[PDB]
Design an enzyme around this catalytic site. Sequence first.
Site, PDB file in Angstrom:
ATOM      1  N   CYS A  48       0.804  -1.238   0.000  1.00 57.34           N
ATOM      2  CA  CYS A  48       0.000   0.000   0.000  1.00 57.34           C
ATOM      3  C   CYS A  48       0.814   1.254   0.000  1.00 57.34           C
ATOM      4  CB  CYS A  48      -0.985   0.015   1.182  1.00 57.34           C
ATOM      5  SG  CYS A  48      -0.307   0.151   2.835  1.00 57.34           S
TER       6      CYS A  48
ATOM      7  N   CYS B  48      -1.712   3.703   0.963  1.00 59.81           N
ATOM      8  CA  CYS B  48      -1.484   4.228   2.287  1.00 59.81           C
ATOM      9  C   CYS B  48      -0.161   4.993   2.290  1.00 59.81           C
ATOM     10  CB  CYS B  48      -1.453   3.091   3.303  1.00 59.81           C
ATOM     11  SG  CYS B  48       0.110   2.132   3.133  1.00 59.81           S
TER      12      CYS B  48
END
EC number: 3.2.2.-
Length: 252
Positions: free
Chosen positions: A75, A157
Site C-alpha cells: 500500500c 497508504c
Amino acid sequence: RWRQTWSGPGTTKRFPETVLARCVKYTEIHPEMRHVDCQSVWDAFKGAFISKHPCDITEEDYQPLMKLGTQTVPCNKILLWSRIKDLAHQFTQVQRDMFTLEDTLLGYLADDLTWCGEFDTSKINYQSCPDWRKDCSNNPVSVFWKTVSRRFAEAACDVVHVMLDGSRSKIFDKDSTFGSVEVHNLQPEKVQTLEAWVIHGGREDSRDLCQDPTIKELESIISKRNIQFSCKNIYRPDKFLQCVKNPEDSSC
Ligand SMILES: NC(=O)c1cccnc1
C-alpha cells in the site's frame, strides 16, 4: 462499411485471446496470482459487457471480474500517473520501487485495449465502440477503468506518488481519472501524503512547475481532505531514469 454505429475505435483484434494470454503470462510471473484460473477471469470479463448495451455498463457489471482479480498491492508503494504512463512504467520496471495500476493483474489485462459488445447479441463489436465524449461515458472501457482505479486508490497508504505531465496545458486536470476518481478515493485515514512528481517536457532549464495554478489547485483539494501534499520537479526525465538505474553512479 462506410459508417459505424459509434464514434470510437472498435474492440481490439483478437481481444479474447489477448486477454486470456495476458492472464497466463501475468499469473506465471507473479506468484501471488499463480493460482488464478484464467478461463474464469476471461468469463467474468466477458460477462461484464457481452449482451449488454455498451452505453449502459455499470460498476456492478465488473464485480465478478473484480472479485477474481482481487490482489494485494504494497500500500505504501503506489505510483499513480496522469497522462504520462510510459515514464511511470519505465520507472517501476527498473527495480520495482513502486507499483502502477498496470502492475496489477487487472490493469495489465486491459492496458492499451478497447472492447465492447451489443445489446441482445452475444457478439463482440470489432467495428466501433462508444466514444466517452461523443457517445456515452458508461461504456465498457470507461467503466472498467473507473472501477479498477477507484479500488487502486482505496488501497493506497502512507506516501502515495503521482507522475504528472508538465508539458500539458493542465498539469493537474480535474477531469482526468487521477483528478476525478483517484484524488477523491485516497483514504485520509491511511494516506499521509500525496507527492507529485511533475515531469518536464521542455529541454533543460525551465519553470518551477510546482507553482503552476493547477498544482496549487491539487494541493488545495488534497489538503482539504486532510492529506499532506508535496511536489517535486523532474526536470530531465532521461536523467531521472538513468539515476534510478545507476544511482550515485553519475552526477545524480
Ligand atoms: N492504463 C490505462 O490506460 C488507464 C486509463 C485510465 C485509468 N487508468 C489506467
